[PDB]
Each structure stands twice: as C-alpha cells, then as structure tokens.
Design an enzyme around this catalytic site. Structure first.
Site, mmCIF file in Angstrom:
data_model
loop_
_atom_site.group_PDB
_atom_site.id
_atom_site.type_symbol
_atom_site.label_atom_id
_atom_site.label_comp_id
_atom_site.label_asym_id
_atom_site.label_seq_id
_atom_site.Cartn_x
_atom_site.Cartn_y
_atom_site.Cartn_z
ATOM 1 C CE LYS A 64 -1.997 -13.467 1.204
ATOM 2 N NZ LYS A 64 -1.585 -13.913 2.543
ATOM 3 C CE1 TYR B 195 3.415 -16.035 -0.231
ATOM 4 C CE2 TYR B 195 2.218 -17.699 -1.495
ATOM 5 C CZ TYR B 195 2.212 -16.597 -0.651
ATOM 6 O OH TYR B 195 1.013 -16.060 -0.229
ATOM 7 C CG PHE C 271 5.598 -20.314 6.714
ATOM 8 C CD1 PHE C 271 5.938 -19.690 5.515
ATOM 9 C CD2 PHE C 271 6.281 -19.959 7.875
ATOM 10 C CE1 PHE C 271 6.944 -18.723 5.470
ATOM 11 C CE2 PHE C 271 7.290 -18.994 7.845
ATOM 12 C CZ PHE C 271 7.624 -18.373 6.639
ATOM 13 N NE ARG D 115 5.380 -2.930 3.344
ATOM 14 C CZ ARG D 115 6.484 -2.561 3.990
ATOM 15 N NH1 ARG D 115 7.312 -1.677 3.439
ATOM 16 N NH2 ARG D 115 6.762 -3.078 5.186
ATOM 17 C CB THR E 92 2.331 -9.626 8.617
ATOM 18 O OG1 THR E 92 3.290 -9.048 7.725
ATOM 19 C CG2 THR E 92 2.127 -11.078 8.241
ATOM 20 N NE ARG F 157 -2.041 -8.102 6.258
ATOM 21 C CZ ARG F 157 -1.267 -8.453 5.235
ATOM 22 N NH1 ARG F 157 -1.756 -9.190 4.245
ATOM 23 N NH2 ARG F 157 0.003 -8.080 5.209
ATOM 24 C CG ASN G 183 -2.450 -12.128 5.683
ATOM 25 O OD1 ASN G 183 -2.648 -12.868 4.715
ATOM 26 N ND2 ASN G 183 -1.252 -11.644 5.987
ATOM 27 C CG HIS H 126 1.045 -10.351 -1.549
ATOM 28 N ND1 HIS H 126 1.413 -9.610 -2.654
ATOM 29 C CD2 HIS H 126 2.197 -10.745 -0.960
ATOM 30 C CE1 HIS H 126 2.728 -9.549 -2.724
ATOM 31 N NE2 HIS H 126 3.228 -10.228 -1.710
ATOM 32 C CD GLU I 35 5.454 -9.309 -5.000
ATOM 33 O OE1 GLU I 35 4.405 -8.661 -4.807
ATOM 34 O OE2 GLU I 35 6.359 -9.427 -4.144
#
Lengths: 151, 151, 151, 150, 150, 150
Positions: free
Chosen positions: C11, C51, C59, C87, C93, C104, C114, C117, C128
């Site tokens: 991100k 999203y 949010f 992951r 998260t 992270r 964070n 993704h 995705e």
C-alpha cells in the site's frame, strides 16, 4: 498515544558483543523514533537505583555489578504502543525461551547475559526515563515518515 | 552445560539454493560456536546409516537418495541449550507450519525440501556427531565473546 | 498445488516508507516466484472495486481514499500454499498484535498504516488477481530453483 | 576455466570476531561455489609451512604464532577467475588502504589483524589447496545455478 | 533535474538467481524512486529492437536469444543523475572488472551472465523507457522523502 | 595510536530518512568503538560555530539553517586511523561522485543532502569533539574485541 515513550538499554554484554547497530535497527525500521540516546558506564550506585525494585533479592548485587561492568547504550524510543512492543521486540526474559525473530531470541543465549533491557510498563517507563535522562537530552520533532506511519 | 553440542546439516536443497552463509549466520549471531564443519556428498550407504531410524518407512529410500543427490554442509555447534534452540531456530518439520523468523519458515516451502537438519535430542546429537565427524575434525577453543555470552 | 497464486500489494504507506525491496525479499527468499508486478496509483473508483466487500462499513471511504493517496506495488506470487503463507508472512491485521519476524510486526506500528495487503483465501486471491492484472501482464516460467524447492 | 579454485582462510581474529557468515556470504552470493571447508587450529609448525615463502622475513615467526593462536576456517572456492576476484573481494593487505566494499575494508582495522587470507596466484593456490585439504575433503558437483552463472 | 529517469532491467539470469530484492534495494535505499515496473518474457524479436544498436555485432543474435530465454524485471527509476549513478551502481560490463560494492561485482561472475542492464545515456534512456513501457504504466508522485533527499 | 578519535554526525536528512542503524553499522562492524553519542536539535547559532571555518562562504548561512532544521545524531568514534577511514567510509562530499560501498554513495543523491558529516583531520576532530561533547559524555573502556582487532 503516538507520544508514548519507553526506555531501552543495551547492557554491557550487548555493547561488548557489538549489537548496537543491530538492536537499534529493530526499533528504527519498525517506525518508532529515537528521541534520546547516550553512552555511559553506570556506577554501581546508579545501577542499584535503576534496580531499586530488586534491592532485597539474591541476584541484586550481581545485576548491579554487571550493569556497571562496562559501557551501556541508553535510549528512549517514542511511538504508539512502543512500550509494549518494545518488549515484544525484546523477547522473553530468558533467551532460551524467546522466539527466533526477537532480539534476545536471535542474539543471546542465557538469562544472565540477555543483552538488553526495556521498560515493562507505562509507569516504570516514565521513572526509567526520568532516571537515565535529563530532560535537556531528550528531543521533540516530527519525523517526515509520521504522515505515513500514523495518518 | 555451555559445552553441549548439536549436529546441523544443510541438506542438498539448502546448498543448491545458496543458503550456506544465511543458515550459518543464524547460529553464529546467536552466540553459539562452530566447533566442526565440512562439505561432502553422502553416499546412499552413509545416508541410510544417518537415517537408520527410518529404515522401514515408505519415504526412507527417498530420504537416502535425496541426502546423497548433492553436496551437504555438515556442522557441529557448541553452546548452552544449543540442541533445543537449534530446533527452535530451524522451525517445524514442515515449512508451511513454521513461523516467519525460523530458517525453514523464511527459506523453504514444502516438507520434502526443508533445507536443513538438526539433532532432535541429546542422544541423537551425540550419535549424529560421532557419525559425521572424526574427533580430529572437531575443535576446542574459548571464544573471546564467551565472557560476555555466559558470564 | 505448486501453481497456487496470491495477490500481494504494498500500500501507499509501505511504498512511501521505502519498504519495496524489503517486502519483496521476504517472498523471494522464501522460494515463491514473482509472476506479476506493476506500480500504479489506484483511482478512488478502482479502490472501491477492490474493497467492494466493505462498501457499507464506516471505514470504507477512508480505505478507498488511502489506497488511492499514492503509488502502490501490485504483485502476484506463485507457490505451494503461497496464499496461506503470504498471510503468515504478512502478520496480524494490527501491527501491534503481529509477532516480530512478520512484515507488519517488523515494519509497521498501527492498523491504519499496516503497509501491505495479501489475499485471504483461494477465491479472493483469484478475484483480486483478475482485478489488478490483465492476463498479458502475468508470466509463466519454471524457476531454475524449482527442482530443489519442490522435488 | 570455471573450474579454477583458490584457497580462502578466515584467520583466528576473523573467527574470534564472528565474521564467518559475513565472509562466506561475500563469496557465496557472487556465484562461486564452496567445494572445500573445515575448521582447525593450526599447529605452530603447520603455520610455518604455509607462510614458508616468508620464512626469511622478520615477522614470519610472529605470523606463525598468530595463525595458530586460535581456530581457523579453511576453505576452497571454485569459479572462473575466483583466485583473482577472491583477492579483489578481500581488498588491500592493509585494511586502512582497502576500499569500503571489501572484506578487510569493512571488517578489519590494521594489517596485523587483517582477518582473512586468500591465495595470491594460480600456483600458490594449487599448493595452498594441497597443503590444507586432502583430496577427499574436496567435492565435485555442478551447482544448479551454473547454467545461469555461465 | 530530479525528474531524470533511466531504464533498469534485471536479465533472466538475474531473475533466475533470485536477485530481485537485492538489486531493487541498491536503488531504493539510495533515494531514487521506482516509477515503472513489470515482469515479462521478451519475445526473440522484441529482444532485437532493444539490442538494435548492436545488430551489427557477432553476438547480437546470442544476446537476443538470451534476453528472451526467461522472465525479465523491467524498471524505470527517477532521480537526479540516476542514469549515471545507475551505471556506477551496476559496475563494469564485465563482472570480473567490477568493484566490490557494485551489483555485478557482488552478484555476477562473467560477462555473458552479467545479470542486469541499465541505460548508458540520456538518449538511450529515453528510447529504452519508451520501448519497454506504455506511458500509463509509469507513475508520477512526489515521494515523502523528497524534501529530505533534495 | 588506537586511541585516535573522530567526530561523526548524522545530519537531519540522514536521521529523517531513518539511516541511523545503517550508518552506525558501517562503523561498528569495522572495529571502531562508539565512545560518545547523543541526539540533539542544533540551535541556528550552534550550527554556526560548527561550520565556522565556512562563515566566509555564500552557503554558510544555508548550511547553518539546515544543520538545525531537525534532530542530529552526534557521535565520537575511536580506533586507529579512524579519522581517515571515517572519511573513506563516508565517501566523496558529493554523493554523485562517491563510490558504491560508501555511506553517501549508497544512501544519498545530492551534495545539498549528503546525510552525514565526519571530521576531516586530527585538528578539526579535536575541536569538533570538544564542541559537541562535554568530557563526561565520553566513555573510556577497552572493548572485548580489542585483543583481536589490534
């Protein structure tokens, strides 16, 4: 919240093993900011003041003699939840029980030489900072990376 | 206690993927000491001797053919609780179940190519060392860093 | 199985903090392979498409404004169990709850920033990928290291 | 051509300062392959037949005592031009005069403790390898990355 | 001045040897910014209009086959003097002659497999960028670290 | 001889770009020892008595404002030839002209933001150290690794 501060100290073994840059990088690359740092050799006196909590324990004297047996890198890191994470970063008290990836886990072998120290709570953090640093030595600035670390 | 020793071997996949320096650094930077090392290509025979415990298992033959399908870096590391920690460092048997930060977790994908091997107990450690090294190849010295690693 | 693919995106905060090489290395050194990558600045529109699942959450708008507030490194990694491990590699998260050793955990402080993704399931992974890449941008080749990563 | 081998040894000061991983990486990541490695504590004598071409100098003795004052990581690396590049990797004899990027320029300070040794030529290489390794100790295999390195 | 861009590509041997992170870091950490990146397997033909200024040489064909023998990480980096420093970062054409500290000096061994390519001038840069990227593929943003880099 | 000290400071742009660990490592891993360190935000004035030998130049003022635009990591390193090697480590004044392997060649782009400062001589060192550190702030101890470095 993003103004929380914790005390991190690379004990003599850490310094004598050349772990300064390495330890510092774990906090720097995380996004926390160095608001205070200095090198020095604690006097057995000072050491006892720092460990005042353990004054009547068998190992108290050892801790004080050791914390003053060589140079130490005292630091103060600022950041949200930095106190708690500073510990997560440091790892278990005993290296043998810390997971790879944590400072103690990666860089130390036994409890007696666990190279670093981090405040264990919001209050001790304040006391510890107040004890190792004169307010003049602490700094206040906004990191350029702040916009992207907290937003 | 600080004299414990374990056997660590970078299997062919690890060597063929150039993980020598990387794997060695995880043990070196921890504070453990390299008391024995060599490169070699196990004979299917030798391989079966090392895996004698699994002689009557389906995968036995595969393991032996694989452990002898290329060069291997055999090592012996000395240090307190090095056997147990050598495993903590290595990670779960299956890479997919090892946590980031562990050798297998960071550098391998599947069980069949889990790049490294470490003794799983004090006895197998002794046997494994006795099997891969002639006592002449092992060394005994006190690291300069010992005063600060164990004290 | 070894053909599974997941979507990983650094991100804006990650990119603005110069974590590209670092994030990429965690996947590259693991043994996974880069089959697709590109840099770009998502339009608030596109962001909402990505999203779409959170369209009616408080949010949602923040996420979309943020994911389009700067450049992003979109990637597609191939490998066995790469989705799940992607992951494990990324961490919880909320950075404050991720263990040292995870992306992270090591490189971020709070949930809102964070830095990365990763697809959370085999289906979202496919969607995705289909959404961020035109099939022409994806590649298919056999890494030299494949013989030793999977065998 | 790509079977050229050189002898590289991490001196006691190098080992004692935990530079094993670091040094080996400079070589491994370049593309050269580790075909021989062992750890050993050279005998005062052994040290002398290594530094034999210097038995004439006023430091030969000093050198020999040191090369036996602790453990040593002896190695044999194979690859094209490895002998020559091995030296470039190591840097000047004197750390003070080595360039940042070289092993000595980065990890050592003075000549007396220049942490590492590398054969300086095709001949000294051949001898040095034979002096430190029994032919069994060496291995022969073609690395998976050979097709992409050469 | 600080909008200068150069073209950097990791050759198949580079990608195949998993040097993507390593190479990118040399550029990222310097201060330059990644404004364009993609992975692709050049067609034998495409390879030829890249190495076109060499269609005269006796290795043009060899080069073109190789630049299409596998995946390639194509990139566009922006920053002041990036074209020139990009080359310093890469090092000599021949790894054997590159200095430790440079990408080729550290990660490659021979000329035939020098793992990477970087535009050699302002012009070749301009062309190379246009030859490998559609203008949409490139991005324009001012990095947070710009105020402290310049 | 091995008690030589030099002054090293990470400029605001360096600190702001999170290069503290990286820079310190170049020095720590070499063998030099950190005998003095602090973080501080130089006052516009303080900046002027540091860059005093340049109060004549047309950038003295510019320099002084910058050296006070943010935090600074001030340091004192000890070791043989540290002053001189400290400079080799830092590289050319102009990043564009520094060699890959040097701090500026790797982490900076332009002269105006060359992220770090290092005493250029025995004298300027002596002064610089006295200008930034009170004698108590400095420490004296013999590192465990001294016996193997020298």
């Amino acid at each position: 919240a993003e103004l929380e501060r914790t005390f991190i100290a690379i004990k003599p073994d850490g310094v004598q093993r050349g772990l300064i840059s390495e330890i510092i990088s774990r906090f720097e690359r995380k996004g926390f900011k160095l608001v205070g740092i200095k090198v020095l050799i604690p006097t057995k006196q000072f050491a006892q003041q720092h460990y005042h909590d353990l004054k009547e324990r068998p190992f108290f004297n050892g801790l004080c003699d050791f914390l003053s047996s060589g140079p130490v890198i005292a630091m103060v890191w600022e950041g949200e939840g930095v106190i708690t994470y500073g510990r997560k970063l440091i790892g278990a008290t005993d290296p043998q029980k810390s997971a790879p990836g944590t400072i103690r886990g990666d860089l130390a072998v036994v409890v007696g030489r666990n190279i670093i120290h981090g405040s264990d709570g919001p209050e001790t953090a304040k006391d510890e900072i107040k004890l190792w640093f004169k307010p003049e030595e602490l700094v206040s600035f906004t990191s350029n990376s702040e916009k992207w670390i907290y937003g």
